[PDB]
Design a protein around this ligand. Structure first.
Ligand SMILES: Nc1ncnc2c1ncn2[C@@H]1O[C@H](COP(=O)(O)OP(=O)(O)OP(=O)(O)O)[C@@H](O)[C@H]1O
Ligand SMILES: Nc1ncnc2c1ncn2[C@@H]1O[C@H](COP(=O)(O)OP(=O)(O)O)[C@@H](O)[C@H]1O
Ligand SMILES: [Mg+2]
Lengths: 393, 140, 395, 889, 28, 99
């Protein structure tokens, strides 16, 4: 029928199972009020419901929000629309200082006498809010081993002015404000993107390249404005592009009736990158697989300065990436990896990790608790034979 | 299909998903078939509808002399016409007319009957109406 | 509800036996304390007294608004039915946890304060694309694979049904699986068979229907597909027929083909670029395998590649049996007249035979089954292949 | 289903074992050679683990079970080799031959004779042959033997060595993560004789590995965060010698055997303190082991390092005692004037600027009891060297204006201004001392004990405050003179000045508030011995409390120092001592719940937690022992702060539902002091659920009960965004929630989170989890707030300067001998890694990265990089030494 | 096949009503 | 009932009275179940297509037991195609009478 996998297998299980059933049967025995078409459970608003709600009824107001057009002289005398109600000439209430009421500002205005009470943060549409990352993944610089030249070049540019604005002052230079990354795939482009977004000390902003192509004209450009407007507010922010071939590579005009709307969007990226009132503290990283069919307006330095390529390292990066991926698993102490790397001369780090995840499958092809070296021998026995007579290769 | 899909749902494909919902539900025909006839056959979503839902397709060729003669008698059935006429000559004056063009002839014969101030419909009315509709059919 | 977050022994260690019995003690005693409330002071304090305090606090006419943005903790911005927007404070009566932008609310008259939330409907996109129920036959339908069955089971099912072995060694399961082979093999069958016997949600996508005559909608349907698949449930995303929509950059032209390039470029990032999607199973099916873009073929995206061959005389004897399992069979027929003879024809051809014999019999209004039913049906399925063949004599 | 034709093993191993009783008698070759030909083959068809289905092991026992039942017993002439062929083959399928009542009969095939060296055919196999079965042996079979008959027959004798080699086998097959399965064996086998199991497994671990110590090492203390009382007594001393015998990591002695100080024996950690004084090589591990021995979990060690090496190796002692404490003063002197702080911020009171325009005008509040809080604009912000010349003029005018207890309070605020000081702290008091007032001097001389707190050098053991005390014929000269010295010498266990201040208890001069804080003063000193304190207290208790049935000045102060003198031991002897000692009426048996659970600060003993609620649950109790169920709930507050987040979620789940919703007086008066004692960092679960009973004051009760829960809801230090919660409540609390009774209290709550910018570490959790009491200084206050009438008179001694054991804050210091290194540090969210794929990504919030004095925070395990090797102690503890080494190109 | 589009606006109507028992002088 | 008019107060927005449904717009334009007459087999020139419809619609209706004996499902959906006005309408009009 069945058997014990480890000793008291059901004996810990139903002890856990009925008490989760009992945590239910507590609540209906106490009386639980759930699913009451959009309310709160009663155990925490019964001591909220009384007169410190009337403290939100009678002292608080409605404060209808608006938008500012301009100011006047000697006095505020502000001209303001609501949204579609009426445009008014109104005044601030006395609870503000007439300093941060600059033009083009969403502000809240009293409903009765039409006076300004609260300045509000501006309208950021959610489609670019969902590309600000707001968290940072756990990727260490040590995890991208095998790239001693490439990380060192990229350390010099993205990291060091943002954390040491001293040496560049004392010598009098300007850092190369934009870097392109390229190479064969699966090599470590996205790893370095995550690893810099780890230690950023900045407002790292993700951009997927094909999120700009849309159905209407000009709205794809209107994204790029809102990016570089938040960039000038969030001082010293990073912007990562990825697969910039969708943003535009050519200016096909022999039969100029094909792609045009991506060209207009790509020209808007050109102007707000460099030209007429520079950006200050913004660094741009790009990453593509074919850096050959791009527009040479991007290839102009000032915009894209360093061309860092990612190769298949030699023989010792593979041994080190082995020591990155096969440090973190449960193996035998009889490791060796110069034997392993000489068996796979042409391979990516993705193909390295694919072997290490394949190696754990053989222990689960078997019924083991561990990863044996001879099992990992048998893991590297198949994947040599697997990669010799692979379907695509 | 999902051409007018995530961009507003267009209210019509949502009805079609409820068409597919009930036919998926239960019929086994039970006593009831459904019949559908279309031109512009290569646009809809028939590949999902091939297994179980709908079935065999039947082609319709352009008609013939014995076909158009029967089509003439059916669409000229609801009239007040006069006998003493060769409808078979009328069917054989049309080499490649369609059945919908036959319906337009029976209107023009009733139109020629009106300008007679008669409720008779003679052979003279059809013989001019066949020449008129085929003159209207003289563009390609 | 979120009573204790610790699971870290994850075995038959004595630690879980101690911790969960502590949780058994803190819950029994909380119950046995509160059982002695309805025994000695069994009062009904807040049946209507909580309600009539609040139903009189809110207005009797309720008005439905719409969330726009959320500011610090109590005041957010809303939108009325016409567009007039109000910077009103919410109360501690509404679930603040299911309060995301783009949702309907309930408002007041004088202060227009947010009083309650109205629950949402079901999105149409699940009802479009999800095979909702267990559609079709189980593993009694398949004809003798037993190795291809074994690979998909330990890649999807055994990770999902019994996750305990991967978390012993800490090794993540492989992500992507390609199904490929000659057409008529059973690629759609094996997807639907796993869709039959499953515990998570399944999503079927025809790849040819990802080409809009508008533009930008290619990547738009992709970025919403995995968005729904992530937000809904444990999910298995199956996309049939990616071979004629995502092949390679064959001439690097423009005018539509450049748009198709952009759709696959979004799909490539939406498959795997950033913030690993989690509990998302991707299964892809092709006929041809060679003219595929190798940036999709690389590991990190797809790790399993499974050949689908054609058996000759062994599994067919059940495929001819299963397709004739629900029909009559007069004694004049032998399946070895056709199984032993020819060795290449697909399982789809076998279904094409086993339906045509049912067509030939009832067209002539006859009884059960003749041998000449299977004779003429096999002859027909030859011409069903051969009349679309330009082959002469040795090419 | 392609069966039939290839079923070789379902036929001939179905026939020849059925022909084995047909070939046992009259066939001497077929009895053994077909047995050996079956035994090697089933062993051959079992070692590969790619097939859990075996073609015999789920096939032969359809008849092989009834075969072996008539082959093994019924033969009755079992030879010397045919038992090594039968039992070696037939003991293999028996966990799958039998169903779930196998557990009594893993022996009717195996213990006929265990055939030879069973791992000879069970070496390479992981768990299928016998390794799960051996765990099935030690679960049920050995435990019924080893319940009362451990010293017994073959069920223990060979079973010791049989488990002796299986426990080696977990680190022998592949050395997997099931190293920790050996404590799943060693603890389940002989649960109470764990040390007799561990003693064989100590030396087996001593020769096992020196790389495969550390994860089983932390697995032991994983199993020692909580246990049964005798198990927590047993495995923690087994934990000790593994960094002493196998490894010499050995810098995890002093703090992680403070783990083992109080359970096993106080002298045992002193023998380990002697083991500190053994491993004297050379200084770097030595200096940091003895860094913690002064002001990080205990003091009282300054008498054991004046032996024969007083040159530098024993001259660290005074350097530990006060000089690194003066380097701890050099933290707030040098490093914290650099980061943020000029001497007078003063402007959290000025942050109440916008209130005067919110609703017209202001200048309405003229309450003289707000002037109590006006000292704390000077008071709390000037901790860690906020020295003030003439910035105390708000005190200096109010010292000479009114408010006798505030004359005491403003003079007691000066000691918190000069905190951790010995150099000129008395020089600042003396100019403000000579006013010849009972309230000014006894506030100032009590503040003298605050200044030299943590120093314990020669300042005044009997010099100043003993000369202050002998002046008594009167008020707080009688009272406030015993308090500062017992506060200053709390961390010591010195006997002499305890006996200088035992005639305070032995005077029987019936000033009740003096003898009450006398038990508070002497209780802060000792936690172990000196039963004569427990004698001297209960003599006056039977004299005074027996001839009364009155106020909690009797009850909140006298039994507490008893529990302070008997804190922290799960032995349940001190309960037998103290509860049988004051066998008495129930208002004196209010003291039953005190010393019962004061010995029970933190462990796993939920059998006490059930007697913590089931006896006095509610009873509806018409105003007789409502205080008794309050203090019974007070002792629910500990045993919850240190199971390391285990009962903390269980505590907030119970008390948020059971008491505050559906209780009457236990909930609606008192049950919020858990959150003022359990959590000390603030998280939006409890930080929002408390104003969901605090913004609603529910004014029908004596509403200062809920306004008591106003004050120590702000008992979460480490300043936050919760100014929104307090200042909005101060706005509704100006007119309403009247300023006559709480205008001090709200701003006491307001000014407390930003005590300074730094120095918030009050959690009673050091290293990772050890106590460092601490508890003796805080718990006087939360006992004191029961409930009213001390907001005016008596609690002003307490409410200012009750808890004063903040140990400092930060871990960013390097202390390589010159103290010039900064670091390359890396702050993160707290660890999650317990047992997964070795080695492990230790934390998750790697985005922050600093180098120098940056903050501590609640959930933080900060590590480093750059190959500095950080080789000191590998736990943490805020004075890492950080030698350097880079042999890795 | 790869063809963009513009857009348009359909503005809603608006109407107001009162109890109309308010006099508008107050001057003089 | 859902999709039903109600009388509503202007001040407290309370219901007064259920207003009746004006017409049911589906059931006002309920599709006609008019008399299934044939013009008979005399649509000659289409007789091959007529034999197809009998063997796909009439043969399931007339002969269920041939499908019940042989064990095959009866069809329920037939697609017709061609130029418009070639009897797409009038032929299925006739077949519904022959059955
Ligand atoms: N040098 C390396 N060191 C460690 N891991 C690597 C290395 N190269 C590749 N990998 C592994 O391979 C996977 C793929 O890396 P990455 O995502 O950067 O490819 P990519 O460059 O983004 O591919 P594409 O060019 O197709 O976008 C990563 O998850 C990483 O774990
Ligand atoms: N092994 C099999 N057992 C039963 N039926 C099969 C088998 N192989 C193929 N078939 C039949 O052939 C068809 C195979 O579908 P499939 O090969 O997935 O189409 P495609 O590959 O073109 O998507 C199914 O309809 C099924 O009835
Ligand atoms: Mg990439």
């Amino acid at each position: 029928k069945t058997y014990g996998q480890s000793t008291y297998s059901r004996q810990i299980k139903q002890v856990e199972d009925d008490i989760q059933q009992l945590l239910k049967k507590i609540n209906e025995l106490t009386g639980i009020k759930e699913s009451d078409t959009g309310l709160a459970p009663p155990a925490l608003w019964d001591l909220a419901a009384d007169k410190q709600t009337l403290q939100s009824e009678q002292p608080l107001q409605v404060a209808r929000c608006t938008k500012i057009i301009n100011a006047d002289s000697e006095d505020p005398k502000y001209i303001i629309n609501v949204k579609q109600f009426a445009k008014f000439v109104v005044d601030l209430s006395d609870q503000v200082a007439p300093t941060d009421i600059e033009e083009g500002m969403r502000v809240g205005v009293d409903r009765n006498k039409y006076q300004i009470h609260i300045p509000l943060p501006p309208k950021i549409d959610p489609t670019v809010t969902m590309m600000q990352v707001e968290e940072k993944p756990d990727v260490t610089y040590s995890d991208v081993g095998g790239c001693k030249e490439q990380i060192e070049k990229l350390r010099e540019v993205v990291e060091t002015p943002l954390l040491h604005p001293e040496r560049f002052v004392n010598l009098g230079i300007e850092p190369p404000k934009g870097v392109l990354l390229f190479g064969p795939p699966g090599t470590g482009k996205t790893l370095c993107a995550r690893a810099v977004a780890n230690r950023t000390d900045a407002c790292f902003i993700r951009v997927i390249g094909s999120e700009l192509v849309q159905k209407y004209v000009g709205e794809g450009a209107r994204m790029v404005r809102e990016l570089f407007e938040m960039a000038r507010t969030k001082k010293a922010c990073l912007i990562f592009f990825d697969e910039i071939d969708a943003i535009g590579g050519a200016r096909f005009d022999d039969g100029a009736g094909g792609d045009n709307e991506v060209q207009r969007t790509m020209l808007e990226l050109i102007n707000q990158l460099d030209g007429f009132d520079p950006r200050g503290n913004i660094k741009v990283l790009m990453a593509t697989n074919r850096p050959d069919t791009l527009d040479p307006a991007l290839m102009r330095p000032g915009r894209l300065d360093r061309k860092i390529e990612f190769s298949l390292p030699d023989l010792e990066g593979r041994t080190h990436i082995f020591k990155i991926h096969a440090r973190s698993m449960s193996v035998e102490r009889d490791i060796r990896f110069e034997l392993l790397a000489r068996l796979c001369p042409n391979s990516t780090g993705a193909e390295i990790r694919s072997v290490c995840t394949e190696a754990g499958m053989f222990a689960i092809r078997a019924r083991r608790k561990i990863a044996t070296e001879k099992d990992f021998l048998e893991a590297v026995n198949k994947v040599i034979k697997s990669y010799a007579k692979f379907s695509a290769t | 299909r999902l051409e007018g899909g995530s961009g507003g749902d267009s209210e019509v494909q949502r009805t079609m998903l409820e068409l597919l919902n009930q036919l998926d539900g239960f019929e086994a025909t039970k006593n009831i078939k459904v019949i559908m006839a279309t031109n512009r056959i290569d646009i809809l979503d028939s590949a999902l509808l091939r297994p179980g839902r709908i079935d065999r397709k039947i082609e319709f060729p352009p008609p013939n002399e014995e076909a158009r003669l029967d089509i003439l008698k059916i669409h000229s059935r609801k009239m007040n016409l006069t006998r003493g006429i060769n409808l078979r000559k009328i069917a054989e004056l049309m080499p490649g007319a369609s059945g919908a063009e036959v319906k337009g002839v029976c209107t023009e014969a009733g139109m020629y009957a009106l300008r007679e101030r008669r409720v008779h419909v003679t052979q003279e009315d059809f013989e001019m109406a066949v020449a008129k509709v085929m003159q209207k059919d003289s563009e390609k | 509800a979120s009573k204790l977050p610790l699971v870290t022994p994850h075995t038959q260690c004595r630690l879980k036996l101690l911790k969960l019995e502590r949780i058994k003690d803190y819950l029994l005693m909380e119950e046995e304390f509160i059982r002695n409330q309805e025994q000695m002071k069994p009062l009904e304090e807040k049946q209507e007294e909580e309600r009539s305090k609040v139903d009189d606090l809110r207005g009797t006419p309720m008005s439905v608004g719409t969330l726009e943005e959320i500011i610090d903790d109590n005041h957010a911005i809303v939108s009325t039915s016409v567009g007039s927007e109000h910077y009103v404070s919410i109360l501690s009566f509404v679930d603040k946890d299911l309060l995301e932008p783009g949702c309907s609310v309930l408002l007041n008259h004088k202060v227009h304060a947010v009083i309650g939330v109205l629950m949402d409907d079901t999105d149409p996109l699940v009802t479009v694309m999800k095979v909702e129920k267990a559609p079709q036959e189980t593993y009694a339908d398949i004809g003798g694979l037993d190795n291809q069955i074994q690979e998909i089971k330990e890649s999807v099912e055994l990770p999902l049904t019994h996750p305990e072995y991967y978390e012993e060694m800490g090794i993540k399961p492989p992500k992507g699986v390609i199904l490929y082979g000659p057409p008529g093999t059973g690629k759609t069958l094996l997807a639907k068979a796993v869709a039959n016997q499953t515990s998570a949600t399944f999503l079927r996508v025809v790849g040819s229907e990802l080409i809009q005559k508008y533009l930008g909608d290619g990547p738009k349907l992709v970025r919403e597909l995995f968005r729904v698949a992530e937000e809904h449930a444990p999910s298995i995303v199956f996309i049939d027929e990616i071979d004629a929509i995502g092949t390679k950059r064959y001439d690097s032209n423009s005018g539509g083909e450049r748009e198709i390039q952009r759709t696959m470029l979004e799909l490539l990032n939406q498959l795997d670029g950033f913030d690993s999607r989690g509990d998302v199973k991707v299964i892809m099916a092709t006929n041809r395998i060679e003219t595929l873009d190798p940036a999709l073929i690389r590991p990190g995206r797809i790790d399993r590649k499974i050949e689908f061959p054609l058996p000759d005389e062994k599994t067919k004897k059940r495929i001819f049996q299963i397709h004739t399992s629900r029909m009559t069979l007069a004694d004049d027929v032998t399946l070895d007249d056709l199984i032993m003879a020819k060795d290449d024809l697909s399982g789809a051809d076998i279904k094409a035979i086993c339906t045509e014999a049912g067509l030939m019999a009832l067209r002539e209004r006859r009884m059960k089954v003749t041998n000449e039913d299977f004779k003429k049906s096999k002859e027909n399925v030859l011409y069903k292949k051969q009349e679309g063949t330009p082959e002469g004599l040795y090419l | 289903m392609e069966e039939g034709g290839r079923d070789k093993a379902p036929v001939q191993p179905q026939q020849s074992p059925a022909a084995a009783p047909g070939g046992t008698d009259e066939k001497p070759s077929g009895k053994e050679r077909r047995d050996a030909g079956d035994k090697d083959k089933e062993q051959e068809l079992s070692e590969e683990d790619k097939q859990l289905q075996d073609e015999l092991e789920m096939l032969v026992e359809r008849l092989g079970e009834k075969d072996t039942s008539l082959y093994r017993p019924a033969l009755e002439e079992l030879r010397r080799q045919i038992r090594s062929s039968t039992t070696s083959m037939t003991s293999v399928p028996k966990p799958l031959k039998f169903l779930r009542p196998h557990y009594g009969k893993l022996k009717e095939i195996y213990e006929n004779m265990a055939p030879g060296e069973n791992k000879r055919f069970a070496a390479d196999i992981i768990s299928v042959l016998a390794m799960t079965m051996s765990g099935e042996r030690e679960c049920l079979k050995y435990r019924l033997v080893g319940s009362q008959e451990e010293l017994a027959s073959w069920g223990h004798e060979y079973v010791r060595h049989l488990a002796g080699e299986v426990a080696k086998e977990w680190q022998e097959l592949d050395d997997a993560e099931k190293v920790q399965r050996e404590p799943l064996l060693t603890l389940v086998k002989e649960i109470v004789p764990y040390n007799m199991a561990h003693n064989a497994e100590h030396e087996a671990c001593d020769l096992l590995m020196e790389i495969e110590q550390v994860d089983m090492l932390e697995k032991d203390i994983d199993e020692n965060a909580y246990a049964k009382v005798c198990l927590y007594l047993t495995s923690c001393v087994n934990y000790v010698p593994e960094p002493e015998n196998s490894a010499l990591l050995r810098c995890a002695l002093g703090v992680f055997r403070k783990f083992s100080r109080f359970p096993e024996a106080l002298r045992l950690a002193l023998m380990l303190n002697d083991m500190e004084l053994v491993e004297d090589i050379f200084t770097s591990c030595k200096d940091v082991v003895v860094q913690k021995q002064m002001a990080f979990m205990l003091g009282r060690h300054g008498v054991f390092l004046e032996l024969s090496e007083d040159v530098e190796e024993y001259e660290d002692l005074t350097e530990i005692m006060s000089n690194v404490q003066l380097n701890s003063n050099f933290l707030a002197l040098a490093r914290e004037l650099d980061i943020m702080e000029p001497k007078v911020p003063d402007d959290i009171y000025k942050t109440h600027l916008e209130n005067n325009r919110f609703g017209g005008s202001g200048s309405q509040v003229d309450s003289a009891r707000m002037n109590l809080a006006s000292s704390f604009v000077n008071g709390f912000v000037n901790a860690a060297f906020g020295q003030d010349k003439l910035l105390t003029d708000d005190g200096n005018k109010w010292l000479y204006k009114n408010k006798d207890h505030g004359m005491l309070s403003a003079a007691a605020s000066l000691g918190m201004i000069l905190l951790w000081d010995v150099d000129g702290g008395l020089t600042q008091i003396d100019k403000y001392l000579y006013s010849s007032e009972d309230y000014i001097k006894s506030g100032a001389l009590l503040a003298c004990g605050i200044v030299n707190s943590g120093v314990r050098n020669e300042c005044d053991p009997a010099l100043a405050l003993l000369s202050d005390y002998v002046l008594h014929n009167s008020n707080t000269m009688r009272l406030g003179s015993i308090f500062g010295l017992g506060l200053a010498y709390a961390g010591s266990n010195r006997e002499d000045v305890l006996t200088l201040l035992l005639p305070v208890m032995g005077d029987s001069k019936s000033s009740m508030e003096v003898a009450g804080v006398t038990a508070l003063a002497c209780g802060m000193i000792a936690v172990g011995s000196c039963n004569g304190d427990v004698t001297s207290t209960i003599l006056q208790t039977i004299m005074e409390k027996s001839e009364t049935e009155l106020k909690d000045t009797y009850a909140r102060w006298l039994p507490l120092g008893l529990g302070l003198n008997h804190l922290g031991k799960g032995e349940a002897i001190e309960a037998i001592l103290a509860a049988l000692e004051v066998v008495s009426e129930p208002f004196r048996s209010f003291a039953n719940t005190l010393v019962d659970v004061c010995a029970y600060a933190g462990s796993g003993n939920v059998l006490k937690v059930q007697q913590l609620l089931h006896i006095c649950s509610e009873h509806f109790d018409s105003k007789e022992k409502e205080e008794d169920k309050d203090k019974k709930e007070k002792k629910d507050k500990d045993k919850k702060e240190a199971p390391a987040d285990m009962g903390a979620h269980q505590g907030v789940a119970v008390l948020g539902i059971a008491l505050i919703a559906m209780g009457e007086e236990i909930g609606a008066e008192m049950a919020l002091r858990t959150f003022g004692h359990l959590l000390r960092y603030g998280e939006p679960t409890l930080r929002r659920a408390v104003p969901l009973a605090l913004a609603l004051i529910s004014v029908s009760n004596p509403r200062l009960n809920i306004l008591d829960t106003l004050s120590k809801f702000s008992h979460d230090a480490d300043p936050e965004v919760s100014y929104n919660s307090i200042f909005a409540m101060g706005m509704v609390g100006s007119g309403t929630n009247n300023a006559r009774l709480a205008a001090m209290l709200r701003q006491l709550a307001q000014y407390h989170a930003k005590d300074p910018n730094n120095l918030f570490m009050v959690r009673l959790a050091q290293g990772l989890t050890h106590l460092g009491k601490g508890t003796l200084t805080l718990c006087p206050y939360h006992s004191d707030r029961q409930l009213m009438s001390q907001v005016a008179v008596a609690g002003l001694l307490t409410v200012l300067v009750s808890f004063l054991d903040v140990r400092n804050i930060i871990l960013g210091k390097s202390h390589y001998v010159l103290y010039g290194l900064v670091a390359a540090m890396q702050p993160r969210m707290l660890v999650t890694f317990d047992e997964e794929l070795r080695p492990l990504p230790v934390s998750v919030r790697v985005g922050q990265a600093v180098d120098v004095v940056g903050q501590a925070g609640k959930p933080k395990t900060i590590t480093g990089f750059q190959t500095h090797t950080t080789p000191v102690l590998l736990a943490h503890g805020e004075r890492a030494e950080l030698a350097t080494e880079e042999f890795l190109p | 096949x790869x063809x963009x589009x513009x857009x348009x606006x359909x503005x809603x109507x608006x109407x107001x009503x009162x109890x109309x028992x308010x006099x508008x002088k107050x001057x003089x | 009932t859902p999709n039903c008019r109600v009388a509503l107060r202007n001040d407290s927005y309370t219901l007064h009275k259920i207003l009746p449904n004006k017409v049911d717009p589906l059931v006002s334009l309920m599709m006609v179940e008019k008399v299934p007459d044939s013009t008979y087999e005399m649509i000659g020139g289409l007789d091959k297509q007529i034999k197809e419809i009998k063997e796909v619609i009439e043969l399931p209706v007339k002969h269920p037991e041939l499908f019940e004996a042989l064990g095959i499902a009866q069809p329920k959906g037939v697609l017709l195609y061609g130029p418009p006005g070639t009897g797409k309408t009038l032929l299925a009009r006739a077949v519904a009478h022959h059955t």
